[PDB]
Design a protein around this nucleic acid. Sequence first.
RNA 1: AAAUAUGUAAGAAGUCCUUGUUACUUAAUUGAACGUGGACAUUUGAAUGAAGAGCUUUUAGUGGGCCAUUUUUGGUAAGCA
RNA 2: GAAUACUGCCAGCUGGGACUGAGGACUGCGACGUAAGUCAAGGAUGCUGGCAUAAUGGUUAUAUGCCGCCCGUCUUGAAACACGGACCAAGGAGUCUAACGUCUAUGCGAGUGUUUGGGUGUAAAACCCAUACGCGUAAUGAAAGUGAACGUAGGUUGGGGC
Lengths: 185, 222, 172, 58, 159, 51
Amino acid sequence: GIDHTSKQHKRSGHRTAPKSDNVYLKLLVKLYTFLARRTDAPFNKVVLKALFLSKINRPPVSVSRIARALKQEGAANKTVVVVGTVTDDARIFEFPKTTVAALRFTAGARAKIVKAGGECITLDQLAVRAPKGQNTLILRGPRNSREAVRHFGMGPHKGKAPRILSTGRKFERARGRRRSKGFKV
Amino acid sequence: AEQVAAERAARKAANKEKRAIILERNAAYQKEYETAERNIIQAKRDAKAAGSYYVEAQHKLVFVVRIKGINKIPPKPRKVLQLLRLTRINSGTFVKVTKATLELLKLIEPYVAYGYPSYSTIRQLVYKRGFGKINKQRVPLSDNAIIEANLGKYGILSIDDLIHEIITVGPHFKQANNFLWPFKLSNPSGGWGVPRKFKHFIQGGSFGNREEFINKLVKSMN
Amino acid sequence: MAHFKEYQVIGRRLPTESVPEPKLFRMRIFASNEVIAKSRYWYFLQKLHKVKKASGEIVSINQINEAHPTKVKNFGVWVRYDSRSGTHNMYKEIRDVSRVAAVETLYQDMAARHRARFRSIHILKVAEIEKTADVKRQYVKQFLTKDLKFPLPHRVQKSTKTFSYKRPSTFY
Amino acid sequence: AKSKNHTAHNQTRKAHRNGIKKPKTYKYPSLKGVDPKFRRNHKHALHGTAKALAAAKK
Amino acid sequence: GKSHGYRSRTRYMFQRDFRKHGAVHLSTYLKVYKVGDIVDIKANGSIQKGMPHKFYQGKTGVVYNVTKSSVGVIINKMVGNRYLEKRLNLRVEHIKHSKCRQEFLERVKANAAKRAEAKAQGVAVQLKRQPAQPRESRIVSTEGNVPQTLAPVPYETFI
Amino acid sequence: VLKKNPLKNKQVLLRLNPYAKVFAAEKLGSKKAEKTGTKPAAVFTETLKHD
RNA sequence: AAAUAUGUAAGAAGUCCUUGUUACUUAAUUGAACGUGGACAUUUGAAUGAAGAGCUUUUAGUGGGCCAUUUUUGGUAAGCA
RNA sequence: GAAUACUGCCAGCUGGGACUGAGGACUGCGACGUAAGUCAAGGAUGCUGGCAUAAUGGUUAUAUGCCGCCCGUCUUGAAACACGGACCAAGGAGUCUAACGUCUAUGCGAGUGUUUGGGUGUAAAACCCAUACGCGUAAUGAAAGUGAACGUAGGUUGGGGC
Ligand SMILES: [K+]
Ligand SMILES: [Mg+2]
Ligand SMILES: [Mg+2]
Ligand SMILES: [Mg+2]
Ligand SMILES: [Mg+2]
Ligand SMILES: [Mg+2]
Ligand SMILES: [Mg+2]
Ligand SMILES: [Mg+2]
Ligand SMILES: [Mg+2]
Ligand SMILES: [Mg+2]
Ligand SMILES: [Mg+2]
Ligand SMILES: [Mg+2]
């Protein structure tokens, strides 16, 4: 017998492969597995781990987010890397000439980036021209902006959104929500 | 001539000078042990001649063997056995003697047998059952290069250097001891010597402090 | 544990600034090994003084051998022991060649006749009786008569084999 | 038919199964329950010292 | 029925000490508490305002808020399987400074002094505390201290 | 692939610890000690024999 | 007035030296809290261990218990409660 | 003045027995040798014999030694003097639907959703499509209403990657 201080046969809890059957994604995973093994650059390891992520853990990254990231000093000539989708944004009216490498570009995002003088690039061409992740800039999208996150942690005084179908007066705005009707949360 | 011999000769020359370093260290450690023993003996003789008494230095090191199974242990001793890394019966660890550790042993006393190891016991234990904890894995030592790869920053280049860092509780004792995996000992070859183990050694049992008799017990256990 | 050795154990309180050089209390202990001898020394200093192992030190432990281990001696042994319903002093005498074996005899004797374990016995004193007529117990004094001699009738001989072919005798 | 009324038996083993955890203190704790006069001052002191820092750095 | 009021089972721990009743001495009120100070809670039974609950008797916490006559003390309370942050508003009658944190602050000053001297002379000043080490060898002289002691003693009635 | 114990297999015992050759070549495990004629003191002997 | 059990602390979110912010505070260029700059070196301030450490979502069964050592209530007691 | 007991050490030598032989070119650490090589040094080889078939082995029946209470169920507790079950075959129990939560996959993404319907067709398929409509891109208030940049869309502390 052994006095087990820890739970036995415990899986790491991390994805080691994409959950999908996309063969082109699996080819990208194979390429960045080779790069994350034969190169010591932590960029290839971070890109490889991001290639395993689910959809909610790969939020889209807008072109306005990319332009804001390019307003940083020393980052004008960098290569923006989005392991996921670059969506479009009409809120902006100027776009810098830059190189963006991403899994997917929406039609609007690709048009805006190309019209700005830049180029859209896949992660394999990213690997070819920047094998060690030279002057790259990895961007991620907002994960807690998801609508499901609003209801996480519901409870008294937590200030969270109830899981509700119909919204308005007569829908959970009474006893328990105001002092005049019983109490307030 | 694809450049194999040049680095092979560089490696053999490096290995030779490393073995010369280990040899000269081991010679100086042997003379250190020899004088440490002879001085104590001659000090006792001198004190007897002068009519006084020579009280020896209290032992800095103990070896602790968990002699009890894993069922029905109260939480406080269970935690202390986990902290001393005795998770299965007949496991053993070295402990530096301080007030904190002595209270730990005084608290797990009914489940362990401990005492003061000798140089022969430590040497045979490390040579025969010494495994290192390397990248969370239990690696048989079997080579000086492994110990130098994991303890080389502490100046411990060989198994003899590890043994000295255990027998004399050096500055890097904590790192060398934790690098050693908990020794997995067998049951004693001639038995425990008592009808019932779970009394104190003073009361004819097996647990507790049996200070110098731990050597004979551990030798039969490995 | 009954293979008793006799140790002298000299201990003292730990020296302090008020009282350097304490008084070196010394006892004679019968025990199988040095660990039990030291433990018995601290047990008796615990009971007889306000000294405990935490605030004390052992300055010497030495085994005492018999001066003449092949000379027959009459030993008077004063003991106190705890019976099942009280505490009692007794005086006994063991005719034997050494103090350690006399103590072995008394521990066996006290276990046989009074069901008193080593846990329950304190050896107050073991003393050589210098001359006869200071012996008081008839079971020892009867062995001191001049020209002592006695037969051993009814010899029972241990047999190496299961079966015998001779109807054995008990002559001797 | 009466049943058992109460016991704390097994409750500590359950509590220690996932451990008893300290509440993970942060730098800059919340100013909830602090004196409002102090909070009102501290807002202006922070505003002024950020103004001075930004003016110096430019 | 059962009774579980606010001050239940506080009969002895809200006593004043024997021959220590009456008014509070002014050194209680002349003590200065800052935010971050570590304090010990012990209710003075003669002041029934700002009194801590019976749970917090003997608890030690950190001051987060300082008001006119009271301090805000943060205490970690074990509720179920975790500790919950609890915030108390206690008058300074029921509050004293942690003397252990006073010696910790003095030790910090002493450690700085030792390192300051060692930066000039005597390097490797070895700041860390160490546990009680085993004793070294010694020579116990017998001259004038001849060992002399007797054996266990016989049983006597003493009644 | 297989743990070879020292204390046997003198090849492995020599792979580790190169001093073992000198230890064997000099019989350091059976070293004879220098004779010393330092007697115990009378107060020690009398204390030991004291009742 | 014990024993056992129990709170807290043992530093980098630290310490010290200057001088900055404020509508709070002081008689005050006094403090309070938060800072700029500077100094502290690898023992970053006891021991042992750490099997990875933190964090989140969501959902099952369960919500009759019983036994032993010790403490302990009712009861003559109980394989009683 | 010696010996011996006891306890301990040897990186002292050696005899008998038992179980195991995992891996499968080489690499390493070594040792003995002036080197060249050799070896018990990152896991067994060499030599020899018999049989080449029911001989070994498998299955099966039996015997012998030891062990083995009737399953399912409710229960703190079942072999129970608790209940269901004489036997066998076949049938026999978490399904589909409306709406929905978390998670995952896919498409497109400030949008998204063709299939109410129209067009067409090799005709309940496949293919093509307008306007709307749903959800989303704005919240808050009982409501009348009003409705999101002082600032490189702020400061501080961490923070992967660069
Ligand atoms: K009940
Ligand atoms: Mg045997
Ligand atoms: Mg009032
Ligand atoms: Mg139920
Ligand atoms: Mg049977
Ligand atoms: Mg059943
Ligand atoms: Mg029955
Ligand atoms: Mg029924
Ligand atoms: Mg029936
Ligand atoms: Mg039926
Ligand atoms: Mg069927
Ligand atoms: Mg069915």
